[PDB]
Amino acid sequence: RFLKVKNWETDVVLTDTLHLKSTLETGCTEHICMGSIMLPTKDQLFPLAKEFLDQYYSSIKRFGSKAHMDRLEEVNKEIESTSTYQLKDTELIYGAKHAWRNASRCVGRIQWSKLQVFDARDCTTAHGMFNYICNHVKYATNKGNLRSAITIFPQRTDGKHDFRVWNSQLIRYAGYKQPDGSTLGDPANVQFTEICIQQGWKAPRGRFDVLPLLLQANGNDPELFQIPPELVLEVPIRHPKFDWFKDLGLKWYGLPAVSNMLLEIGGLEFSACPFSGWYMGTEIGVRDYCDNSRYNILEEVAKKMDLDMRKTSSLWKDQALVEINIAVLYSFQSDKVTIVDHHSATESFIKHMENEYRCRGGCPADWVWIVPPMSGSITPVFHQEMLNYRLTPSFEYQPDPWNTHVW
């Protein structure tokens, strides 16, 4: 019931007690581990509010204070009457920061306390959401000196008045299925792109077209908006040694801004809460560029390098992979856009993990997601045992709005 994690490279053992606070279910059982699976009322509400308010008030050294008891009383009174309750600004900020802190799949959590929270609960329309999102993008981008931020739209009421950003990220490239059978652009984004077109987006049918925003306010029908091109910082990708690399025509955007997750705080649900940090290089160079179902550029790069691609054992894929990732890091650095390499990031996570065990009694972490998609065991996280469990406040997945939307 008191759990130990070992690092097999350093022999450092840490003891976890934080897991006992856990409330949500993992998907695993005593008979089966599902660690590698990607997606495993007033009565409901008050214990959740109470649980949250208790940790909030404990965080500010006022547990068992009159202010705590008063707040609990007021929220309770508000739940009985209104069926829901409104978070104080202090509580919302605490909750958002803690959702990030609790994100067991996030390697960048050493940064968790430095998050700019934009309260957009006064938003009523999709043009309003657009304005808030442009402001987030500009603030977060900061001319390449990225700053973590989240923008929080009104909370779910009855489920028929949901605010939703339909895009999976604020900035992402379109995908088009060709008659020649191939895929133009980002294969990941074909279905959403088509939905943009149905709703009226006039597509330029390129390889790197920044998608428009599809914004849904108050459970109303979603509307299209285009982000000002001047607010979308992008980076042409070149290699510090291969002069030919720029001829590949590759580029990526600076700001990773995830917009399809659900933020849960004190039982309240925020279905539209786009957030952003900065990239770890492997997200672009390994996954975006080299996944077979993404831009899948390994073959092309390999050929330009004149590698022996006859046999797997020449490790031509591995060689090309490293070079692509060198170029990504080189390009962002050269243009002064914040990025972190997988070595620095994982090294930071180990130190964060040790802080959290020391100061909080643990750190929920999903090894399958924390270990980078290249060079796993030369990063320190590979050798670090981790316990995965679900704490609240949390970021959750939610269904894509189109499957759900009553048009």
Add this chain to the structure above:
Amino acid sequence: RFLKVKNWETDVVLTDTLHLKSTLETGCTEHICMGSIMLPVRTKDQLFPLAKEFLDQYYSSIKRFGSKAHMDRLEEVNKEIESTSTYQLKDTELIYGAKHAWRNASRCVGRIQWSKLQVFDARDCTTAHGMFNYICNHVKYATNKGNLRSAITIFPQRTDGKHDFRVWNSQLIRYAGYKQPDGSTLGDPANVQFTEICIQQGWKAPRGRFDVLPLLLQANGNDPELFQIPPELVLEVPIRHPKFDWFKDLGLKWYGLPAVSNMLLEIGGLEFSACPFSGWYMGTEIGVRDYCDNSRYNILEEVAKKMDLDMRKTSSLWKDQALVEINIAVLYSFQSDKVTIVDHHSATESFIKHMENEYRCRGGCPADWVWIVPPMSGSITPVFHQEMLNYRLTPSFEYQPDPWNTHVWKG
């Protein structure tokens, strides 16, 4: 109950029913996943259902379930258990059991080969000298002048737990490690403790960087005895690089035969505490883990210097770059010397095909993603994108405590 797994690269969805036959626990609960944790005397009481479960599986597999032979065998085993408190497997049952322990090993990426396993029955062995002879024969058979053949040698099962057969080595062939007074380590740091034990037991150590350790063998619960594997039986491969001529001057080599000797084999409730087995290497085991783990030979820097990479900032990916070149060299050297080896691309590709075949023919394939995904270039191999279900089936290979921690010394 049906469980689905999805491959996120192909959208292929598989359905698992085999997990229903799982009996043993994982370590996980509905509240916590322990998927990344490395390590999360039996009564006639518990023993007969274990034997019966196993014999039902064996007899089903030979399409003789419910036959007179099946029924008679159950009866024979029950009587043997109640009268002798244990039982003896038939040779056929032993071979089936050893093959299935491998088939069931959720951490093994090489399972496409599971049905091709040479089983050596060493249950008639009584002394450490006898174990040494059996082990030499295994090494020579398995090595096959570089054309490696998978094999397992099985020593007598546990009785009261006081007469255990044990191989004290973690692998039959492994390099010594020596802690120096200045805190540095010579040879393989992973083997320092075992090396000290051997030296204490009387081994005269050459004290080099690649000294093949002696076997330390325990028969019938007696104190272990030292033996040296004939050097002519130990196939080694000097590591060189196909493009970089300076690589040979690093002085690296490795042995051809990975032969794990510290696991426990469980079949039908019986426990085989000494069951050395061997296959062949996947390149990354040597080139990534043995060579580049900080706690092992740790050669990344020296290689990176020799390549003259920019080593002032990690963002140059100098470590990733040297890592690939080292792994190219390992594959190149083994192939050049005609010693069986498999690269991580081929191995993971084969594993996916194996897994899909197992889903169709068996209803599942327990697999530990944490261990199946190779320690370099993870997502450019197909296993990274494959959802897997981990659960425990028997027969199985299990961990057991190191014998020096439990052994009662006779003196």
